[PDB]
Amino acid sequence: SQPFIYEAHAARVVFGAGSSSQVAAEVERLGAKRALVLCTPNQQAEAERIADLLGPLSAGVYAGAVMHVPIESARDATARAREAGADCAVAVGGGSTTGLGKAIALETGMPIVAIPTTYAGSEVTPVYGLTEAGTKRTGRDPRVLPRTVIYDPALTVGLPRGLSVTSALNAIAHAAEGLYARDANPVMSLMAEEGIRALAAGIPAVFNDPADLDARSQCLYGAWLCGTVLGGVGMALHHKLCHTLGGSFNLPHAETHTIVLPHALAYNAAAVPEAMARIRRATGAGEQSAAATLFDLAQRHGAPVALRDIGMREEDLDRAADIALASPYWNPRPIEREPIRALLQAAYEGVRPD
Amino acid sequence: SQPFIYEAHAARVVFGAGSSSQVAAEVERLGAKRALVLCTPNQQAEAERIADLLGPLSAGVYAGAVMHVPIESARDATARAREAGADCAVAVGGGSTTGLGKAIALETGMPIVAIPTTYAGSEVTPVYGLTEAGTKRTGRDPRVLPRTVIYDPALTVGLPRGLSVTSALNAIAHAAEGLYARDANPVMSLMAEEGIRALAAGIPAVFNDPADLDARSQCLYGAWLCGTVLGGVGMALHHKLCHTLGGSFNLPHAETHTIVLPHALAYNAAAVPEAMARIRRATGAGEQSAAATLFDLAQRHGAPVALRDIGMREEDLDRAADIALASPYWNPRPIEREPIRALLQAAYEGVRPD
Ligand SMILES: NC(=O)c1ccc[n+]([C@@H]2O[C@H](COP(=O)([O-])OP(=O)(O)OC[C@H]3O[C@@H](n4cnc5c(N)ncnc54)[C@H](O)[C@@H]3O)[C@@H](O)[C@H]2O)c1
Ligand SMILES: NC(=O)c1ccc[n+]([C@@H]2O[C@H](COP(=O)([O-])OP(=O)(O)OC[C@H]3O[C@@H](n4cnc5c(N)ncnc54)[C@H](O)[C@@H]3O)[C@@H](O)[C@H]2O)c1
Ligand SMILES: [Ca+2]
Ligand SMILES: [Ca+2]
Ligand SMILES: [Cl-]
Ligand SMILES: [Cl-]
DSSP states (O other), rough: OOOEEEEOOOOEEETTTTGGGGGGHHHHHHTTTTEEEEOOGGGHHHHHEEEEEHHGGGGEEEOOOOOOOHHHHHHHHHHHHHTTTTTTEEEEHHHHHHHHHHHHHHOOOOEEEEEEEEOOOGOOOOOEEETTTTEEEEEEEEEGSSSSSEOOOGGGGGSSSSHHHHHHHHHHHHHHHHTTTTTTTTTHHHHHHHHHHHHHHHHHHHOOOOOHHHHHHHHHHHHHHHHHHHHSSOOOHHHHHHHHHHHHHOOOOHHHHHHHHHHHHHHHHGHHHHHHHHHHHEEEEHHHHHHHHHHHHTTTOOOOGGGGGTOOGGGHHHHHHHHOOOOSSOOSSSOOHHHHHHHHHHHHHOOOOO | OEEEEEEEEEEEEETTTTTTHHHHHHHHHOSSSSSEOOGGGHHHHHHHHHHHHGGGGGEEEEEOOOOOOOHHHHHHHHHHHHHHOSSSHHHHHHEHHHHHHHHHHHOOOOEEEEOSSSSSOOGGGGEEEEEEEEEEEEEGGGGGGEEEEEEEEHHHGTTTTHHHHHHHHOOOHHHHHHOOOTTTOHHHHHHHHHHHHHHHHHHHHHHHHHHHHHHHHHHHHHHHHHHHHHHHHHOHHHHHHHHHHHHHHHHOOHHHHHHHHHHHHHHTTTOHHHHHHHHHHTTTTTTTTTTHHHHHHHTTTOOOOOOOGOOGGGGHHHHHHHTSSSSSOSSOEEEEHHHHHHHHHHHHHOOOOO
16 A cells, blocks of 8 residues: 556557458558558568558568667668658567567657567567667657557467567566566556466467467467556566676577576565565465476476576676676665676576575 | 457556645646636535645636536636636546536646546546536547546545445446446456455445545545546446436436446346456355345445435336336347336345345
8 A cells, every 4th residue: 555656658459369450440540551561581471461451551561670679770671661651660570570660660750550479568668779889778758659559369379389488488577577666556566467377377378289379369468468567667687687688698588588587586585575475376386486486487388497508608697797786776675796696697507496 | 368459548647645745746747837626515625725735836726516517517617717727627526526627628628637535436537427407418538538637545534434335336336347348358357356356345444444544545546447447448237227317317326326236237147147256256245146245235334225215216217217228238138128127126125136
């Protein structure tokens, strides 16, 4: 019963198997006449189906989305949008594709329709990212928040078995830290816990059958709730450290989240037992720790659990601990060198937390 | 997982004991320079405290709000606003005061800051009502949605023992029908169930001590969630029938919802077992039906459970049934005269549902 200020962003979310077939209707609803479809080179097939659904509303497909939105990709995409007379951007892909859409919207003001194909949750946050001279700069601007999100679990069926797990833990991370945010509120916490519950149940169902559209729906729904928590309350240690590892050492995004989460939770656990108890309840932990339970959820379904396995040099951990301590931020427990360095060593080695 | 389209209004909600002290900042935040405070003649003391907190931002207090927003109060209030040069209205009170505020916003476009003191939930719906030539017509329009809502449980301490119960059941009714709405969605249902849970626990706590600020927070929190469901999904038999009874027979509002809800639930129960299971879970029903449990929640806490106790004439029941069947609207179980008339007989006499 502590006071709070709740803010909800305007949102329009179209959800269900086959929903991507209504893409033209959603562009028309925005009053847009020339929508540019965005994707990575690996998702051109999906992008083409979207472009075909748009028919004469299509401004073409720009298939150069790239991880962490290099500022020169943002420029190139925006140039193409301008050249096509685009008045709308339709992002078909994961966090990186949404991110290119966000960059175009940042420079042009045009609406974005997001069609997410991972569990990253970027489609519902006002946070954008640009990588310049190797370092990712992020900011917040309502302008980058997609006007409409179309969640179609059919587009996640082919999400590979690995990323389906690791992106799912990335989403759980948003919710886990949301529960202990300095600006936590009951509504965000309600959605946080439900999001964790949905993903915790969906990971094994999807792992057993990646073509199960109900299991896929349950994960996408969880991803939406998690992303909503990310967009509404402040993150802390886990997200900051993942940014450090990803940005300073080029570690793959979802996998870094997956490996770090249990150790970031172990670090903060003593400080926020109420949030931990909610994470445990939502993950079916029983008497187990939140940390151990999330570790097992990753491990049991084939995700890597050691930074060693995703390209982190053991010899860079000392530097990683220094960078983790460089730019201060609020966290429930103080960020100190030694225990951060020990968190990093345990994450490196893939030690199951107690 | 069945498909849906979730739309959400931008929202700002300041919640907690003492939040009404922030009213001046909330008005400046909207860019307004002259807020007219609105209330019923019974709540002028609280309006004055608000007008004083507004200091130089105060355009004064209009103390003429009335049940079901008579069109003349509406026009008079607007005049006062207009002659004050007000660019903002602060509604301090229950649904009737929020209503006047909605009426002024409908006409002039000015922002409303809602400071609710009952559990009706109007503060978060786009529905407005006007009474003209003794008959109340409603409509919907985003323009009537308050830009900011300030929930201060200290302003509900003096909500009388009777209305505290009946208003709370009016709130529960919104969540209950929201759980079986044709356009039900998982987020609205998550809030619906949470709303019912808060109010089911809060009613007896408030009954035990009306000055208990935690009990009062719990109720107001529940009211907000239930109001949000009321504004996001379609209601059915319960709300339609209450509008008929209140409108055509001039029955007291909160009392009518309270009396009708168990019987509208009993009518629908067999069509929507899953929604009934969530209602039973949220109300601690155990093996009892939702209908019986909500009847008991009213009765145990001294609310009326028979329309006869609030002035309905038994000879008018046939006409109420006629009006209840006047136009076909969607409801999970088909609306048919014989079982509707029997529902009315049961509500009229206060027969506890099985
Ligand atoms: N701004 C924010 O609020 C926010 C939030 C979360 C993530 N992000 C950012 O998003 C990026 C991470 O995004 P991500 O983890 O979604 O991965 P990604 O967008 O970088 O996708 C990784 C690869 O998977 C492929 N892929 C994605 N969905 C697929 C599908 N369903 N079927 C087949 N292949 C598919 C993509 O084409 C890509 O090649 C990072 O840059 C991260 O920082 C930003
Ligand atoms: N538009 C919508 O979505 C919607 C939803 C619910 C109700 N309503 C409308 O609201 C009206 C009824 O609302 P209501 O049930 O809030 O009652 P009310 O607003 O009519 O209040 C009843 C009486 O109780 C007093 N009161 C209210 N709060 C008090 C407090 N905290 N302490 C002491 N006295 C207090 C009021 O001054 C008034 O005299 C109806 O006209 C109904 O249709 C509209
Ligand atoms: Ca070595
Ligand atoms: Ca060092
Ligand atoms: Cl724990
Ligand atoms: Cl039941």
